Amino acid sequence: IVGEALEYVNIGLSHFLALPLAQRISLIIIIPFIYNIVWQLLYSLRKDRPPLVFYWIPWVGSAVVYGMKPYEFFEECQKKYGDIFSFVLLGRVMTVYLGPKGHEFVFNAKLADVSAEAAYAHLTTPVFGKGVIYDCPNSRLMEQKKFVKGALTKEAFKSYVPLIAEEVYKYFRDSKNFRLNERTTGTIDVMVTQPEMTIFTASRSLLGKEMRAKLDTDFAYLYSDLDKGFTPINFVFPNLPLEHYRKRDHAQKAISGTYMSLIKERRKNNDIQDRDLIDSLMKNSTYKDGVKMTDQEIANLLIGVLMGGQHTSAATSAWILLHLAERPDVQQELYEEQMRVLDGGKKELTYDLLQEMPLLNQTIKETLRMHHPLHSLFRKVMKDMHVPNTSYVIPAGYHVLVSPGYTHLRDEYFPNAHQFNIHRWNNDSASSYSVGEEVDYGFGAISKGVSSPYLPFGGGRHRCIGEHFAYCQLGVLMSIFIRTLKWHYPEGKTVPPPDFTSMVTLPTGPAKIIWEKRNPEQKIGGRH
């Protein structure tokens, strides 16, 4: 009789409920652990799914090894399963597509197939504020990028260069890390100096003199507070009743308030010029459907732009210094270019003269190859995607993960990829260049193909608009570093490994270099 079997399901259920809590809280952990191992083995038999990396702890997935060393994880996975493979990350399924075909599959994915804001909104909305970037539909983001880029013109760059140069020299004069009028040599942590130099140069040029003046006050602490809110933790715990979260949110309110204060005072005096990004968004932030951005949204977009460029740029100048510190040959070669292009230093550095410095630009270009600030770019898959020339279907609710930074470091696309060699870019010093046809998603013509193995600024609709600002900033900064200082490592030190757990792939610190003045008796003028 099978009826007697069902009685014993009932009985056995009643006996299960009566086991000691030693056994039951055992069995609450044992049952999903074994059910997970069963589900994976069954999953491995589906041929319409990319291979899934095996993991033990349910939900947590491969998070630990991915988070700590993602390029090593990808290379081991790539040897095992080829270029397309999935792995489980703190509750989500990430499908990785390595190589140029992966750049194409993700960066050029149809707007209806994937969503960046669905992957990213919790990462950034708590830090930037509401209504901008990833807290708004894609069509709003596109036009927001059009607004910001409209202030990022070559004529803006010609005016930013002397301003950035003034900040770099101010920092050499006044910062405790240098004091070039009092000290001719010294030790700095590049992960202390570069964030400060970056925010000082970016504030002065994009935000204007008033906002730059605030960082000389206690207001600087709010920037520090807000900056600590910029962490990948926000992926999992975006809001918590802790203290870190309170100063972050306070700082966002306080900083966006200072921006709205300045915006509302410029409009009441009609003090609206072409000075900085604030003027620019004030004159040009009405969407095509007629909606104006609010003063709050404009301020929030300013925080997003300044914050993103802060961490990519600061990490990149740190890496440039760290690589050059063990390459006095490269510093020497860069210095000769500076003497030739600037008539032994008797020409004032201009945006135009920066474009005549191919080796300096190639040094930035090579640093960005070896240290892509963003090792992984995410999209949430919104409807099922067929992976061309496979039987693979990526179902909706998965995520796709693209990693041009991994391809940057492959010998097949960059011979001797782990060697720093700026001369691999000889007669190719452009920050990037569209290898053919262009398309415009709402913020300007950009390259249509994204199959280049070198993609420091991504591609497609979510492509960076900061590239020329970053090269302007990095170029002025490194031109002055080169002309002012030599530097090298403390004894037995070398290039640190990256910190992949962070918001960008910044160097693991402290990472110290010893600078020395090229001209001990050179003084920097001005009052302090």
Looking at the Cβ atoms of 178 and 454, the one nearer to ligand HEM is 454
Looking at the Cβ atoms of 186 and 466, the one nearer to ligand HEM is 466
Q: Which of residues 65-94 bind ligand VT1 (CB under 6 A)?
A: 67
Count Cβ neighbours within 10 Å for each residue of 22-50 and write b for 16 or more, e otherwise: eeeeeeeeeeeeeebeeebeeeeeeeebb
Q: Which two tokens stand for residue 85?
A: 């493979």
Q: Are 438 and 447 in contact (CB under 8 A)?
A: yes
**H helices of 175-294, where?**
190-202, 209-214, 220-228, 244-268, 277-283
- The closest residue (CB) to ligand HEM is 466
The option from ligand VT1, ligand HEM, none interacting with 255 (CB < 5 to 8 A, set by class) reads none
Tell me how far, at minimum, the Cβ of 464 lies from ligand HEM, in Å. 3
The option from ligand VT1, ligand HEM, none interacting with 145 (CB < 5 to 8 A, set by class) reads ligand HEM
d(CA 204, CA 226): 19
Using CB under 6 A, which of 53, 163, 305, 359 touches ligand VT1?
Answer: 305
- Residue 134 assigned to a binding site: yes
Looking at the Cβ atoms of 305 and 334, the one nearer to ligand VT1 is 305
Tell me how far, at minimum, the Cβ of 402 lies from ligand HEM, in Å. 7
As a whole number of Å, the end-to-end CA separation of the chain is 97
The option from ligand VT1, ligand HEM, none interacting with 131 (CB < 5 to 8 A, set by class) reads none
The option from ligand HEM, ligand VT1, none interacting with 12 (CB < 5 to 8 A, set by class) reads none
Q: Which of residues 399-458 bind ligand VT1 (CB under 6 A)?
A: none
- Residue 323 assigned to a binding site: no
Looking at the Cβ atoms of 129 and 358, the one nearer to ligand VT1 is 129
Question: Do you find a cis peptide bond into 510, omega within 30 degrees of 0?
Answer: yes
Q: Kindly tell me the burial class for residue 67, based on how many C-beta atoms sit within 10 Å of its own C-beta (0-12, 13-18, 19 or more).
A: middle
Tell me how far, at minimum, the Cβ of 144 lies from ligand HEM, in Å. 8
Tell me how far, at minimum, the Cβ of 470 lies from ligand VT1, in Å. 8
Residue 317 binds to ligand VT1 (criterion: CB under 6 A): no
**H helices of 17-115, where?**
21-43, 63-68, 70-81, 100-107
The option from ligand VT1, ligand HEM, none interacting with 67 (CB < 5 to 8 A, set by class) reads ligand VT1
d(CA 313, CA 89): 28
The option from ligand VT1, ligand HEM, none interacting with 458 (CB < 5 to 8 A, set by class) reads ligand HEM
d(CA 404, CA 465): 17
Tell me how far, at minimum, the Cβ of 440 lies from ligand HEM, in Å. 14
Residue 481 binds to ligand VT1 (criterion: CB under 6 A): no
- Residue 462 assigned to a binding site: yes
Report the SS3 class of residue 366: helix
Q: Which residues bind ligand HEM (CB under 6 A)?
A: 116, 141, 145, 305, 308-309, 312-313, 316, 368, 373-374, 377, 456-458, 462, 464-466, 469-470
Looking at the Cβ atoms of 282 and 377, the one nearer to ligand HEM is 377
Nearest to 380 by CA among 99, 49, 111: 111
d(CA 447, CA 38): 45
Tell me how far, at minimum, the Cβ of 403 lies from ligand VT1, in Å. 10
Looking at the Cβ atoms of 206 and 349, the one nearer to ligand VT1 is 206
Number of amino acids touching ligand VT1 (CB under 6 A): 19
Give the β-pairing of 92-97 and 399-402.
parallel
Residue 374 binds to ligand VT1 (criterion: CB under 6 A): yes
Looking at the Cβ atoms of 149 and 493, the one nearer to ligand HEM is 149
The option from ligand HEM, ligand VT1, none interacting with 376 (CB < 5 to 8 A, set by class) reads ligand VT1
Q: At what angle do helices 154-174 and 467-484 cross, to 10 degrees?
A: 40
d(CA 186, CA 212): 27
- Residue 379 assigned to a binding site: yes
Contacts 24+ apart (CB under 8 A), 247-252: 248/126, 248/127, 249/126, 250/222, 250/225, 251/222, 251/223, 251/225, 251/226, 252/126, 252/127, 252/128, 252/129, 252/226, 252/303
187 Cβ contact partners less than 8 Å away, ≥ 6 residues apart: 490, 512, 513, 514, 515
- Residue 247 assigned to a binding site: no
Nearest to 443 by CA among 136, 148, 114: 148
Considering only the stretches 120-128, 149-157, 488-496, 520-528, report the one whose residues sit in contact with ligand VT1 under the rule CB under 6 A.
120-128
Considering only the stretches 96-104, 119-127, 183-191, 256-264, report the one whose residues sit in contact with ligand VT1 under the rule CB under 6 A.
119-127
The option from ligand VT1, ligand HEM, none interacting with 124 (CB < 5 to 8 A, set by class) reads ligand VT1
The residue count for the chain: 528
Looking at the Cβ atoms of 379 and 486, the one nearer to ligand HEM is 379
The option from ligand VT1, ligand HEM, none interacting with 368 (CB < 5 to 8 A, set by class) reads ligand HEM
Residue 120 binds to ligand VT1 (criterion: CB under 6 A): yes
d(CA 325, CA 86): 39
d(CA 514, CA 459): 38
Q: List binding-site positions for heme.
A: 464
Contacting positions for ligand VT1 (CB under 6 A): 67, 120, 123-124, 133, 232, 235, 304-305, 307-309, 312, 374, 376, 464, 466, 501, 503
Q: List binding-site positions for heme b.
A: 120, 134, 145, 379, 462, 464
